[PDB]
């Protein structure tokens, strides 16, 4: 039975390699919900828990504020404030002085991000406490948080290939800016090339 | 004290011994897979001895079932009998060959008093 179908198998990460006993509770909570419900949320929030720690990028309160201000500008203006769910964890943002009274549900908060919320007027939730309020996740604004600009993702590449604005692995920052990275050293890594 | 029903048919009986095991008083009756590039066993010729596959796995419904029904469970003292007595249909005790004689009688006494079948005994009383 010739197939060719040998490499079409995708790596889905069936479970979590985490050993945190308080996330294996959220995972069994969100296998029950993600399986025995017609919730699109519970499906999605379950693969994001079993997901790793480098893939659950943190969203700063700045990101949470701005996108919850882009929701709350087009609502019934008295309907409700949706819950900003992030399956990573929330970090404070000293670039946002004034924060609205927004409800947030993260696996974790900074000690400065929990107080910034509670001082603002909102209440930060948990996931055993969100399974009580919209377990199906009605009126919840699910969030990732930027994982680009991460210093790992901007070494990815070659950095000597034309059109590769990646950072070479070099402790000495003033080591490799010579020949090959100069227009007057017999070739300059071509900053642009159509791909 | 009686077993529970099963389907105890077994796939293979002859153990998997390593190759050229008899030609050398040094090798062991313990399967090591032949890493040989041109070994006849690894490339699986006809009259060669087989290699443990997943395909030889026992039926799981009757896997680990001693020929007397009664999947086995090692027993060290009489208090481990009570921890077995609820599965005295599904499990059987096995005293551990280091439990001496003074304690091994104190067990085989309790087993019959508990109907917890032991795979070990029959000293003028079964």
């Amino acid at each position: 039975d010739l197939t060719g179908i040998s490499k079409k198998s995708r790596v889905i990460r069936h479970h979590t390699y985490s050993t945190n006993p308080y996330i294996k509770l959220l995972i069994k909570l969100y296998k029950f919900l993600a399986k025995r419900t017609s919730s699109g949320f519970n499906k999605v929030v379950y693969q994001r828990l079993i997901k790793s720690r480098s893939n659950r990028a943190p969203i700063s309160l700045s990101r949470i504020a701005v996108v919850m201000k882009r929701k709350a500008v087009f609502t019934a203006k008295s309907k409700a404030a949706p819950i900003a769910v992030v399956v990573g964890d929330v970090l404070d943002d000293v670039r946002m002085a004034r924060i609205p009274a927004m409800r947030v549900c993260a696996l974790r908060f900074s000690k400065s991000a929990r107080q910034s919320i509670v001082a603002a007027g909102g209440e930060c939730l948990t996931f055993d406490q969100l399974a009580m309020i919209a377990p199906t996740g009605k009126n919840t604004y699910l969030l990732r948080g930027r994982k680009s600009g991460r210093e790992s993702v901007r070494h990815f590449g070659a950095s000597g290939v034309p059109g590769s604005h990646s950072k070479p692995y070099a402790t000495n920052r003033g080591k490799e800016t010579k020949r090959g990275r100069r227009t007057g050293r017999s070739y300059k890594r071509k900053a642009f090339r159509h791909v | 004290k009686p077993t529970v029903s099963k389907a105890i048919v077994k796939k293979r009986t002859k153990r998997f011994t390593r190759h050229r095991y008899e030609l050398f008083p040094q090798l062991s009756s313990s399967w090591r897979k032949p890493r040989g590039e041109d070994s006849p066993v690894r490339r699986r010729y006809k009259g060669q001895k087989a290699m443990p596959n997943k395909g030889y796995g026992s039926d799981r419904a009757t896997k680990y079932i001693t020929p007397s029904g009664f999947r086995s469970f090692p027993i060290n003292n009489v208090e481990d009998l009570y921890m077995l007595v609820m599965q005295n249909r599904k499990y059987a005790g096995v005293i551990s060959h280091t439990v001496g004689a003074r304690k091994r009688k104190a067990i085989a006494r309790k087993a019959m008093e508990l109907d917890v079948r032991l795979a070990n005994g029959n000293a003028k009383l079964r």
Binding site: A158, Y169, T171, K175 | -
Partner: protein, 132 residues
Amino acid sequence: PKGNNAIPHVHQKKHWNPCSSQKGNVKVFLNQPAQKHRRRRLRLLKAKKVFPRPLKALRPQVNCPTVRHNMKRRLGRGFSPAELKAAGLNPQYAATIGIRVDSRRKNKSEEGMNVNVQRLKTYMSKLVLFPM
């Protein structure tokens, strides 16, 4: 192979390994817990020997030099002839009653000695100096 690794620059090419042929040139700190106990044992045993004197002498405030540290204050060794003269004490007699003396400091800003001249007469107040 190699590939997208940082150029190592490891600097271990000078017979540091104490092998069978080379005596080795490594300093392993397997004795620092013994030494911490060792010093605090001398320290606490030197303190009851110098008693009733303070174990540490008196050192002045001095400004850490460079632009990176100039705002950080620090305890330098000895005061100066100047603070001692501007506080009465002979630097020969200050150097024998616990005050530490530095004939090299230059008192470049009066600002500097003012913090330390007054810092002496705090000590010279709360010091008994009972005779022999």
